[PDB]
Amino acid sequence: APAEILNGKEISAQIRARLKNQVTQLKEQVPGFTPRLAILQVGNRDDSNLYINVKLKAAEEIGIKATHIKLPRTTTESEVMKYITSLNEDSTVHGFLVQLPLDSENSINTEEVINAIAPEKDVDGLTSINAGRLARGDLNDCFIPCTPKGCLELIKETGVPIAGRHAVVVGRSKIVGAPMHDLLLWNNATVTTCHSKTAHLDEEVNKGDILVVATGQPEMVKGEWIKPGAIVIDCGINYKVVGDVAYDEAKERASFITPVPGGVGPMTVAMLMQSTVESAKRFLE
Amino acid sequence: APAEILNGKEISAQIRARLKNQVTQLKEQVPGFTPRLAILQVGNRDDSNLYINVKLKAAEEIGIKATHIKLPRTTTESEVMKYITSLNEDSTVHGFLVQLPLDSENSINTEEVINAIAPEKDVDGLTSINAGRLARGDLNDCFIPCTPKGCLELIKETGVPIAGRHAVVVGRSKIVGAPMHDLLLWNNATVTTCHSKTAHLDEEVNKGDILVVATGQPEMVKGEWIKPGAIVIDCGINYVPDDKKPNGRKVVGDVAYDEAKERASFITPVPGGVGPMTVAMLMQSTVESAKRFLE
Ligand SMILES: NC(=O)C1=CN([C@@H]2O[C@H](COP(=O)(O)OP(=O)(O)OC[C@H]3O[C@@H](n4cnc5c(N)ncnc54)[C@H](OP(=O)(O)O)[C@@H]3O)[C@@H](O)[C@H]2O)C=CC1
Numbered sequence A: 001a002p003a004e005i006l007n008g009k010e011i012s013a014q015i016r017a018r019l020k021n022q023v024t025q026l027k028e029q030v031p032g033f034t035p036r037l038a039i040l041q042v043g044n045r046d047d048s049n050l051y052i053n054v055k056l057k058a059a060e061e062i063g064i065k066a067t068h069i070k071l072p073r074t075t076t077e078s079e080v081m082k083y084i085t086s087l088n089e090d091s092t093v094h095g096f097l098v099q100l101p102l103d104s105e106n107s108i109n110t111e112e113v114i115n116a117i118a119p120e121k122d123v124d125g126l127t128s129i130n131a132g133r134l135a136r137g138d139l140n141d142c143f144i145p146c147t148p149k150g151c152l153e154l155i156k157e158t159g160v161p162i163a164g165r166h167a168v169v170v171g172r173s174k175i176v177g178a179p180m181h182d183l184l185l186w187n188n189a190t191v192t193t194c195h196s197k198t199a200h201l202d203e204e205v206n207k208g209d210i211l212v213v214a215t216g217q218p219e220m221v222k223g224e225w226i227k228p229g230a231i232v233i234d235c236g237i238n239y240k241v242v243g244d245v246a247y248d249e250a251k252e253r254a255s256f257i258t259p260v261p262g263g264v265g266p267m268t269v270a271m272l273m274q275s276t277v278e279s280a281k282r283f284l285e
Numbered sequence B: 001a002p003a004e005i006l007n008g009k010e011i012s013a014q015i016r017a018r019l020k021n022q023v024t025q026l027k028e029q030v031p032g033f034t035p036r037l038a039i040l041q042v043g044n045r046d047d048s049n050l051y052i053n054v055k056l057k058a059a060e061e062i063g064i065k066a067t068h069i070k071l072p073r074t075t076t077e078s079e080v081m082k083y084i085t086s087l088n089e090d091s092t093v094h095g096f097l098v099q100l101p102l103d104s105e106n107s108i109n110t111e112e113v114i115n116a117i118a119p120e121k122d123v124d125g126l127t128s129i130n131a132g133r134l135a136r137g138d139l140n141d142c143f144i145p146c147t148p149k150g151c152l153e154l155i156k157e158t159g160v161p162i163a164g165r166h167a168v169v170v171g172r173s174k175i176v177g178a179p180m181h182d183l184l185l186w187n188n189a190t191v192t193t194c195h196s197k198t199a200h201l202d203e204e205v206n207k208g209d210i211l212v213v214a215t216g217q218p219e220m221v222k223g224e225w226i227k228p229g230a231i232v233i234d235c236g237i238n239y240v241p242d243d244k245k246p247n248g249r250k251v252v253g254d255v256a257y258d259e260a261k262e263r264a265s266f267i268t269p270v271p272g273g274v275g276p277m278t279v280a281m282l283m284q285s286t287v288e289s290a291k292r293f294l295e
């Protein structure tokens, strides 16, 4: 009856187990070497503290050393830049990220802080250098944002080839929608990108053989709009916790669907660990 | 009720006249200020020499100081790198570009040469950093590659708002299709990107209220595919022998113009649509860079 559930909890546990074995093998080859991730937080939001704790738990399980630096809410852009520079120059740190959003009493230009991160350590894939490689199809060379990466792995778990499909991405943020569009295009989908100024969103969603939703508007994408047999990837986390897709209705139209929670969420953490292991391996290569 | 023709020759000439007036006024508001472009060439390709002469003559008519550095075919990659660093560090040069393709007897990594250009001076807009800013919506200060920048100016000359329209871009190159998608997306069109692996391309093109075609596939996009009333921008430059022309050849676009003009509301002819805008767009990006430096 209903769509096949893309179980992100199970898929991500498989990815984390493979990464744990790859890091154990790297440690056997170069005893004493330890892949290391740093997370820089500004402020003390409760949601960011919980998400960072999930990232630190996954890192510890895989065998990655993970450092959390937490700066106060009085922090300035200059003070944050100092910590980024320190991390860029610390040879023991292979990858690092800035947890977003920054929670400070002062105005801080997020793009400037993010673009101070060395591209080789930019495991969240948000620097303009990494975004510009991805946006132009240059994939040998770059870190891809973890949520889109996770979404692409979920779509590949269906076994249905992406090339030639019509994909619709709802949302164009730097963290999710814009890079998701690029991943699907460079995997040879024909891609439509919709956003808050799209007219007739229902008609555009209905064109989607693959549909990735990342709007942060609870259950806004109605099941009725889904193209029968579509693969539906829902990145929304909205407070019950619900996605950006009305799941009970969409599951009767899609072929494959991600639940919320347990879909994209766990895959994003697995993909950050995969990028961190790659950053350690590139360092060794 | 055929389409209105978007005359790129006349619109580019107006843009260049406005830029000239802007440059005169900047020079009078800030005595001594001298907007400056540099063009770095490696080797001596005839095609390159022709294109560079056009850009230099356009810069000087506007009042932009344009410097041409021509390095010999025996130049090595490290030599080109040193010149790019010097131009990055030269506070008198507000924008510069590397003429492609390089013509050297030595292997030179073109991607590494271009990505050595400081993003704040990349007037051609193809560094990965500039591409990343444009792709993520930083249109207030990034540089836009000239061909898509001239496509957008032609779309805006129609007077029809872009926001909320469904735009289709056929082609996804670094030079045209990919930056064109970003310009339409961040002008709030809903954008569909198509390419050589698109199935049912005609059905996709027929959804386009705005259509920009940049494939190099001569007259592939037939008139019947055009959505009635669309704005049709054709970037193609395709040569076809035609003994009835002065020079024995005609230029055709990537759209079958004769049938598409009966369907579109606005259309760019080929020749004379997108083509004539490109140098004016590079001069517009050079004045933008000079103004950002001035501030
Ligand atoms: N599990 C995880 O680890 C992650 C979950 N997410 C979740 O993904 C969702 C989106 O996050 P993020 O991308 O950062 O969000 P942003 O709020 O930055 O962007 C949301 C996007 O959705 C668009 N949008 C909003 N309303 C509509 C609408 N009515 N119709 C069409 N488009 C609309 C916006 O349009 P416009 O650009 O016009 O403003 C914008 O492009 C959130 O629920 C977030 O919590 C995100 C990252 C990670």
Ligand SMILES: NC(=O)C1=CN([C@@H]2O[C@H](COP(=O)(O)OP(=O)(O)OC[C@H]3O[C@@H](n4cnc5c(N)ncnc54)[C@H](OP(=O)(O)O)[C@@H]3O)[C@@H](O)[C@H]2O)C=CC1
Residues within 6 Å of the ligand: B147, B170, B171, B172, B173, B174, B175, B176, B177, B194, B195, B196, B197, B198, B201, B214, B215, B216, B217, B220, B235, B236, B237, B238, B274, B275, B278
């Ligand atoms: N007037 C000017 O100064 C300029 C004119 N142009 C003209 O624009 C045109 C394209 O140039 P450029 O973008 O550099 O070219 P490229 O060859 O780099 O890119 C061609 C693009 O068109 C797509 N394409 C090719 N065949 C088809 C097809 N059959 N169906 C759908 N899509 C297809 C390709 O798809 P895929 O990605 O799948 O390979 C690719 O994305 C050319 O005619 C060029 O001369 C370009 C620059 C400047």
